[PDB]
Design a protein around this ligand. Sequence first.
Ligand SMILES: O=C(CO)c1ccccc1
Ligand SMILES: O=C(CO)c1ccccc1
Ligand SMILES: O=C(CO)c1ccccc1
Ligand SMILES: O=C(CO)c1ccccc1
Ligand SMILES: [Zn+2]
Ligand SMILES: [Zn+2]
Ligand SMILES: [Zn+2]
Ligand SMILES: [Zn+2]
Ligand SMILES: [Zn+2]
Ligand SMILES: [Zn+2]
Ligand SMILES: [Zn+2]
Ligand SMILES: [Zn+2]
Lengths: 335, 335, 335, 335
Amino acid sequence: SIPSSQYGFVFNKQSGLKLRNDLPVHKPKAGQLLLKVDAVGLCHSDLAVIYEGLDCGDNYVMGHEIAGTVAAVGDDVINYKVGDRVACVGPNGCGGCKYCRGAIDNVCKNAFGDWFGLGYDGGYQQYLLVTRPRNLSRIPDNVSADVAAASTDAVLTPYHAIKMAQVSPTSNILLIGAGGLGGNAIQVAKAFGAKVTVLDKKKEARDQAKKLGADAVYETLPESISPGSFSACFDFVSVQATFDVCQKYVEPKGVIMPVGLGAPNLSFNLGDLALREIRILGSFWGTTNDLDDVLKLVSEGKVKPVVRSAKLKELPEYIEKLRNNAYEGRVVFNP
Amino acid sequence: SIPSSQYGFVFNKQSGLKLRNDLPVHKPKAGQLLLKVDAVGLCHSDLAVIYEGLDCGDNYVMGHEIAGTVAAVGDDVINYKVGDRVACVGPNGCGGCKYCRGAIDNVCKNAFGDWFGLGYDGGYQQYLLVTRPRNLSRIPDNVSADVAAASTDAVLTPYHAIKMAQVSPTSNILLIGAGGLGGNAIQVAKAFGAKVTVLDKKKEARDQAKKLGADAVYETLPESISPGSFSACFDFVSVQATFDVCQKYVEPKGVIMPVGLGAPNLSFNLGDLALREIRILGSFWGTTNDLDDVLKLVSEGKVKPVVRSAKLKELPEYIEKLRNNAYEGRVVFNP
Amino acid sequence: SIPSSQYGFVFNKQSGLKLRNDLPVHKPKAGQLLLKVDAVGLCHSDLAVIYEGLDCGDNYVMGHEIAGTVAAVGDDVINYKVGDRVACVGPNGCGGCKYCRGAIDNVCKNAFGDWFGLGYDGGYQQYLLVTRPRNLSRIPDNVSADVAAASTDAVLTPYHAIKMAQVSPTSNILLIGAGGLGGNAIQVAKAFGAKVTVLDKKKEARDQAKKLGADAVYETLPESISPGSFSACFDFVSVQATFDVCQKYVEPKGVIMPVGLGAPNLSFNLGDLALREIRILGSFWGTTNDLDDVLKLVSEGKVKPVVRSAKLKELPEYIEKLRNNAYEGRVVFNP
Amino acid sequence: SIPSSQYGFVFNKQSGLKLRNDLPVHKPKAGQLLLKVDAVGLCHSDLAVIYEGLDCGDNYVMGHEIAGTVAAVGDDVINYKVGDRVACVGPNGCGGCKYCRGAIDNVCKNAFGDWFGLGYDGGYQQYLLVTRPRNLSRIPDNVSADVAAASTDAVLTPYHAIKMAQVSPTSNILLIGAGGLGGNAIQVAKAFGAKVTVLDKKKEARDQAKKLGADAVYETLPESISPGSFSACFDFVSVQATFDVCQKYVEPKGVIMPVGLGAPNLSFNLGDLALREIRILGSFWGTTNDLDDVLKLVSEGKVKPVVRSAKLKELPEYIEKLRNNAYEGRVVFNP
Ligand SMILES: O=C(CO)c1ccccc1
Ligand SMILES: O=C(CO)c1ccccc1
Ligand SMILES: O=C(CO)c1ccccc1
Ligand SMILES: O=C(CO)c1ccccc1
Ligand SMILES: [Zn+2]
Ligand SMILES: [Zn+2]
Ligand SMILES: [Zn+2]
Ligand SMILES: [Zn+2]
Ligand SMILES: [Zn+2]
Ligand SMILES: [Zn+2]
Ligand SMILES: [Zn+2]
Ligand SMILES: [Zn+2]
């Protein structure tokens, strides 16, 4: 019993994010599929689109952290049957260019501004039209639709980055910033078997880290901790200051991964980077395969993300709370 | 002016390959695309389907070595416009599973028996329906539709294998069997800058190799050639005998690549393979991206494949010729 | 107080392994180093040298699973000072050829028949002359000299192979044979975060596996377990039968690692290996760096090997016990 | 007939580089080896040590671009016999730490300030004491001692960087600065089969490039050349300006390699680097194995470096010439 009208929050550069009860319910052209949204997360990114003026285009339902159930499938759709529970791979790669075909759909030039809920329609509605089903990840049975939604960015982003760094059980990494996403980072790192050293200014952030399995936690790296000794450094703050710490403490041939949004530019010392073959790798969100891995890990209990439910219509208020960083535990919404 | 009826050679397990003047001309559902076939090759593979009983299913136009021009595109098709010249990526990966999304669409479990002209409809017709456009490679302007067609298997297969082996300019490889596809192998190997040593029983095969740029050519590997000294061995014959030569002459941590069809099983010496960390890697055809690379190489003139044209309807005779190995220079057909 | 005479067990092809109280105590030429043996293990390998006729040369103290303390260092030795506790990297790579310089000293052509206690002098003496100190791994303080000794083969071999397979937390591996070394394999695999499925005929072997953290344990792989679904297969039995199981159950582009000694030759099905890009990688023992990682893991308690001590002179009896497989829990000996 | 006194140019922070006729001729402690210097190059690096104040320590013969012949070998030296012609691997890695054992001896923490002729004694003498023979590369018979010496930095550095970038025949790279070392870079890149686009301000540099095999050469990159289209960018100038060009023109997931010395710091745009997964890899000189590859390539004639001979004693003047960049064609010296 699929309706033909539905409610949802659209975003318009003129009117901001406004609720609407007159939203269509597209039927699946063949190859496409209709997803009944079960849980959709909210993170800081969403706020940059609304307040901070991040241009992703105009007139789209929002929310990229999407989990839902297959409601209707166009003909020709054979990998998904109605009922199948799935998660949305944010970047919504095009699935046909050299980057997607090459295992990096997260950087697809063609899909720019066609990301779920950041160009294309998101999950802040009730029934989402999935133009390209390749960008879906089957949700393991033992995983709630809320937990999955939480993982689409909060866990996927860090997993992608740590995988990029090729962290192993012999790894000795440094994490700067255990608050933002950086919480799940710790669990993900540990799941790889690494020795994780966390660095944070805030006392809660540090306590959390301890409880989460961090091997060492510091306000400031001690003098006993020797320079150029970490195999990989993940800067979640990413400010000239923090990056400098990374380049100081990363070992030869190591990896510095600026995965924060704290400065528009960062500088590195050419002589040091060169002489010690330091590698600075940029990573962004995750691939469709990554999300597959992320759910296998959440399902396996190696990562447990922290989320609290809410009737979708309650969104507006949670956004004002988060706008003033009045909440810092992922919030998923049930439409 | 796209007709609605067309001619082509269908394959039926009951009647073999038979010409038909009553073939439909499917119009592109959105997302699909119609390809006017310009050149379609024929290779031994095709013969195993017809005589040797290789099961790929029933009732499909055949020929997987396909080159043609975009004639009509469904709506939603934005990466290809009418006119665009393209080549068919044989395996026709599904473009939505863990293997396709992960850069190995050539092993897509979902596309089994849906390969162009080996499960799904091939290029032995006039107008092919391309269900998934991801499996197309833009043909460089300076490349004839015949040369492209030649490359879809003859060159693509070896290129994929050699890339898999990570051959470099410092490589020292051994090639066994310069007749079958093995001809293009030599050029491809040289294009990577490797030192190629060819081994063949037939004298023509050897002469060809010389002319093609082989660094050394032998009937039998000389005693002066030291054991365990080749970085990679490509057995194009793949017979217990030839494989034994590879394992004898490949160096520690080297690669033995059984890329022939000469025996259903091959055995290796466990003690030697383990003690010298020998790697046996299986490869098959190529990926969509590989074909992209293959055309950049053919266009760049680093690989010139050998092909002779023919009106498509002339197919039946060429198949009887090849059936008794009466021809050994790729034959493309123009429909 | 370094003596100049010492006891130890030498191996002669004529007299077998015989105790000797007249053994020299070589003083360190510069660059060399003298190691006071603290614990030396015994494994099946040793038996093939003595009974089964494995040729490694003649007249050497035996035992390759070596742990000890630095007793005297030649001049020029700056990385090790007297006192430093170390473990012996079996292969004793040459440290100067393309393989050692290239991170694979375990396959050094130059060091053939110069392996500790399998060509060169081992640890079944009291004071071993370490010709090349590069082949030593500092033993973490919290690790007993017995545990270290245990790890030089028992753990090192499997860790090297698993790392070679690039097992990750998203991995889904299959292990065939949880008795021989295969016990530590399980822990090592788990330390990487993989999902381990074990397969063994013996009931104890299976029970052990369960207790050790195996995710699934079977006598025979169930029919519910789908073919071509494991990322990597480690055959510790390595018999045509077991290898066949691997090739049946390994997924496309997967890894089959014949790490057992059950047959001198094994055969694979060419068509399957090729069509599904299956990779057969041979591995052998471990590198110097591997042992570094192995001790960081043992020290970190991610792997706890099972060993029982014994006065070195008690060796002869333990060898007869093991000769009739009357003992199956690694035995280290203190000289 | 090995003397016991010899001439050479020592460097002292107080007196600069001064000739000396009273230099010892160390006899090889076992494991060591004595090299009769045949050719020793001179490059800008050497000038930073003498004028620009680069601290590498005190009192050492200089010149790191060393080629010579084995004159005496200590006992225990089995890989080299007297007579063997060899080249010096600059970094002189320690051959015993995690970095050297792991294939990156060029970043050895232990060998800091113990580099040939930049901490330890160089080739500006007649007979050099090679403490660690692992850091030697056999010189191919068809390669002059002068050409080898030229290659130890001039060719080795770029080869190491290009290999690090994994340039292939399908690569499309950008080179900024074809004067400094950047000349050999072009040949090296072409030896891998890449499509090389060079960018230089000076007109000679550009003309050279053309003659050297560059595919395209520009004063300023044209507007027809599309942004984010190069697989790898090598900045040999490395100035905020040039780096910016790299980040603008490198494609998604591409490589920017700041291999020049034009600025002490460089900044990158975080948003772009992250959103397009751009990788900035630092490289430095080369490994011992790299030099092995470099000589195989020079011997194979794929790279022909440009050098002019000179009696060693003529050094002082060539240094004043180069000091005012009055010469720009590598100069090797025969002692
Ligand atoms: O949604 C994300 C990544 O989590 C994002 C990050 C950078 C730019 C735009 C959006
Ligand atoms: O068409 C190919 C590869 O060229 C083939 C190879 C093996 C089995 C079936 C088909
Ligand atoms: O000691 C080992 C590996 O554990 C061995 C393995 C194969 C051949 C000779 C010796
Ligand atoms: O000699 C070199 C590399 O060519 C060098 C480069 C950077 C710092 C010190 C020395
Ligand atoms: Zn988000
Ligand atoms: Zn794409
Ligand atoms: Zn074919
Ligand atoms: Zn697929
Ligand atoms: Zn052993
Ligand atoms: Zn070696
Ligand atoms: Zn230099
Ligand atoms: Zn070192």
